[PDB]
Design a protein around this ligand. Structure first.
Ligand code: 1JV
Length: 833
């Protein structure tokens, strides 16, 4: 390690938001072992990736072009405008034509490429132009394909700098210690020790209740019922203090297959006034305020059916993820495990029927896994694959076969599930995992995947003491292979977000909440912003939620502090790309304090719902705008241009006090349209966007909102916002919306009938991916939201998608829900006083 291999680690630390060489919060060397274990996968992907295709990161998809985009192509004829310097000429191209093919038909000096104007997006590679996402983007929104002809970026810029016993298990509980304990009166306290494995407690022992003081000693040997050999890899020694106050975990089998042995002083997590933070093997960094517990360990290892029963098994196999397996169910699944293995959909249930507390069985289970023919050959089922990666599975072998199926995902799809896959790292017993390496692998192989991997990881590192260490080692592994070029981009990005966040917080503190703003405030803002720009704001930076865009200089005149109780910064940038065809600013809202992780997840689920609707050839017109969570209750938002709140459109009127009126939405659309045809396209867009947001919002159970949290574009696109919070209504189908549909209380119409028809199609279309939706929702709650009910809410999703009903009831169930919105009118809306 030279002197210029040390000022590098300082650079990595500031890019991560955490120091991965800090060994202050460890009781073993797993984190360091994982840093070294990741060197091989890092260099293995860095060495097998094509410098040229990696430098341009073509965004492609292998899915068939949807019907709704085909009808936009009446001809077979796609137009592509090309520019040099000033002038330009248009060309008629076949949807099947390659970048190479279109190139030869333009010439009709052979090393030029097609970049998108204003963007860092490239139409390169041996793929039909119809198979480029940018092209597909243009076709939908009625935009025109514009490209500039320039030279491929130098792959040298991506260069990477060089590198270099039948005994029963027992634990002695020495005691628990805490510097300060007060509140109130005086209770009794005991230590609870669980032996866990995939949310299955295998055995459980308590101590005797002792008076609660700042030091409580026991010196007690807890002898469990599970033999040492019967301990499975990944099993956790879960220690908890009740009066439930504190918890902390200790992997019983370490990362070297060694039985944990010796003395340990663990600082515990407190419970804040079920959730994935309770599974972490990390100890509390805060050594001066946290409860600690002292233990001792001294005890290497892993060294044909009657028709009626089949019907039962099939019934079992047929149930939803959330349907609890009975003792009866589990014994049946196990006993018929070779038959159960022929059904990929039974795997989660089958591996949950396994008694992991017994060696002979785990072994038989591993035998089961070596005869993995059906699973290997099955088509990739993301939902099936995600279930095996949640909190219910700690066996690395079971989990490895899910990550196996993930290997066959193309980058398009990896981008779809990147966020929840990154969150899925929390369910891994160990820091080094096939899932972790997968992320690392795909992230180094593709710049777009790498870019988002960076922010998703950096997001968690900034606001999760429970999992920041693990994520920090992983991010470091990525940053040591992404290349000098992106190391520079990220640097630029991190520089800018941190500076603006100081400014966002310094402005919020200056102004008292409610009055509002507030003139000095607007002046000081422009001043801080003047200070940052000369100097030094990075001259240009990638928009984190849209790596293609490079924001440039601020437009300080358009920048302001918004009129909300939380003082969000409204920032506007100039596009740093000169070749851009538009003169629009890049709009960004910087805001504390919403928990924008909830917004990130929800939004991503929305994007998943779109891809689901794309499979059935549907377009419900969603606007899953850009949103990155950057720290604790703080992040950035994309500003959708010319969009207003529904509530702002009602208060175009004198009355105030939420005296809402029915006709306005349709007028607002009429003013904002130049022609009447565009108005008609806005009405149509509204009917689709409203239908889409009614269905998804109902499924996710975030359908009951105030019209301050629902927005519409001047182009007629409806969409929800502000998810990071959250009599009764299914969703928002307010009378003002219906009026745009040509109804107002108890009537119907050719646009409303359309609305009702599209919802049911959309609704039934999501139910074909029920399992995937359930598992994502369930995961979202565990890793993204405040401590919840590891029953009830997940249970609400079951009901919403009407699990176990025929398609007919569901169509009506949803039609009933539309009517509940009609029967309530403004009631719920008016209440949102
Ligand atoms: C950009 C203009 C000048 O053409 C028109 N304009 C747009 C906005 C606006 C306001 C808020 C948002 C926005 C365009 O983009 C749409 C996406 C979202 S999400 C969101 C949000 N999430 C959580 N809280 N909020 C609102 C706030 F940022 F105020 F906290 N706000 C916006 C206001 N005027």
């Amino acid at each position: 390690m030279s002197e210029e291999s040390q000022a590098f680690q300082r650079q990595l630390t500031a890019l991560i938001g955490y120091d991965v060489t800090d060994v202050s919060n460890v009781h073993d060397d797993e984190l360091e072992f994982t840093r070294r274990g990741l060197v091989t996968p890092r260099m293995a992907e860095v060495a097998s990736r094509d410098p040229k295709l990696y430098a341009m990161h073509p965004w492609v998809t292998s899915k068939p072009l949807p019907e709704y985009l085909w009808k936009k192509i009446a001809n077979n004829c796609i137009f592509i405008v090309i520019h040099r310097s000033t002038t330009s000429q248009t060309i008629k191209v076949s949807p099947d034509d390659t970048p190479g093919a279109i190139l030869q038909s333009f010439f009709t000096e052979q090393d030029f490429v097609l970049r998108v104007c204003g963007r860092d997006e490239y139409l390169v590679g041996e793929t039909p132009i119809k198979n480029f996402q940018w092209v597909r983007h243009c076709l939908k929104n009625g935009e025109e394909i514009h490209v500039v002809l320039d030279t491929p970026p130098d792959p040298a810029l991506d260069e990477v700098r060089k590198e270099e016993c039948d005994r029963k298990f027992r634990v002695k509980i020495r005691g628990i210690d805490i510097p300060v304990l007060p509140r109130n009166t005086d209770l009794t306290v005991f230590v609870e020790a669980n032996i866990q494995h995939g949310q299955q407690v295998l055995c459980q022992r308590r101590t005797s209740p002792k008076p609660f003081t700042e030091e409580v000693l026991w010196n007690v040997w807890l002898e469990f019922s599970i033999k040492i050999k019967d301990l499975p890899k990944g099993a956790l020694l879960n220690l908890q203090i009740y009066c439930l106050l504190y918890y902390v975990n200790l992997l019983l089998i370490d990362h070297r297959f060694l039985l944990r042995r010796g003395e340990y002083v663990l600082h515990m997590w407190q419970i804040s006034g079920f959730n994935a933070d309770k599974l972490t093997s990390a100890t509390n960094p805060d050594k001066e305020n946290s409860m600690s517990i002292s233990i001792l360990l001294d005890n290497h290892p892993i060294a044909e059916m009657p028709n009626q029963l089949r019907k039962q098994l099939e019934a079992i196999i047929a149930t939803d993820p959330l349907n609890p397996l009975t003792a009866e169910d589990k014994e049946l699944l196990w006993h018929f495990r070779y038959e159960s293995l022929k059904h990929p959909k039974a795997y989660p249930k089958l591996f949950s029927s396994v008694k992991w507390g017994q060696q002979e069985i785990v072994a038989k289970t591993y035998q089961l896994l070596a005869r993995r023919e059906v699973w290997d050959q099955s088509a990739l089922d993301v939902g099936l694959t995600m279930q095996l990666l949640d909190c219910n599975f700690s066996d690395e072998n079971v989990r490895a076969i899910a990550v196996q199926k993930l290997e066959s995902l193309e980058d398009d799809d990896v981008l779809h599930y990147l966020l929840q896959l990154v969150q899925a790292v929390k369910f891994e017993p160990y820091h080094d995992s096939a899932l972790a390496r997968f992320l690392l692998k795909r992230g180094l192989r593709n710049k777009r995947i790498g870019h988002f991997l960076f922010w998703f990881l950096r997001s968690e590192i900034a606001q999760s003491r429970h999992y920041q260490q693990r994520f920090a080692v992983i991010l470091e592994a990525y940053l040591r292979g992404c290349g000098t070029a992106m190391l520079h981009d990220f640097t630029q990005q991190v520089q800018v977000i941190e500076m603006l966040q100081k400014v966002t917080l310094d402005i919020k503190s200056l102004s008292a909440e409610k009055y509002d703003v507030s003139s000095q405030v607007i002046s000081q803002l422009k001043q801080k912003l003047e200070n940052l720009q000369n100097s030094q704001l990075p001259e240009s930076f990638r928009v984190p939620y849209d790596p293609g865009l490079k924001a440039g200089a601020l437009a300080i005149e358009k920048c302001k502090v918004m009129a909300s109780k939380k003082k969000p910064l409204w920032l506007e940038f100039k596009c740093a790309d000169p070749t851009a065809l538009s003169n629009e600013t890049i709009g960004i809202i910087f805001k504390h304090g919403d928990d924008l992780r909830q917004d990130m997840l929800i939004l991503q689920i929305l994007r998943i719902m779109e891809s689901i609707w794309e499979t059935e050839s549907l377009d419900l017109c969603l606007l899953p705008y850009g949103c990155i969570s950057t720290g604790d209750k703080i992040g950035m938002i994309e500003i959708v241009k010319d969009a207003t709140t529904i509530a702002k459109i009602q208060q175009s009127t004198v009355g105030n006090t939420g005296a809402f009126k029915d006709e306005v939405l349709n007028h607002w659309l009429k003013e904002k349209s130049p022609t009447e045809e565009k108005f008609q396209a806005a009405v149509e867009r509204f009917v689709y966007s409203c239908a889409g947001y009614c269905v998804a919002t109902f499924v996710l159970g975030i359908g009951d909102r105030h019209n301050d949290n629902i927005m519409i574009t001047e182009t007629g696109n409806l969409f929800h916002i502000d998810f990071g919070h959250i009599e009764r209504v299914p969703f928002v189908l307010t009378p003002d919306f219906l009026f745009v549909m040509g109804t107002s209380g108890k009537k119907t119409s050719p646009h409303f009938q359309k609305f009702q028809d599209i919802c049911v199609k959309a609704y039934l279309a999501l139910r074909h991916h029920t399992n995937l939706l359930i598992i994502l929702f369930s995961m979202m709650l565990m890793t993204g939201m405040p401590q919840l009910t590891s029953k009830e809410d997940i249970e609400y999703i079951r009901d919403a998608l009407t699990v176990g009903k025929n398609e007919e009831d569901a169509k009506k169930y949803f039609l009933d829900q539309i009517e509940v919105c009609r029967d309530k009118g403004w009631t719920v809306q008016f209440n949102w006083f």
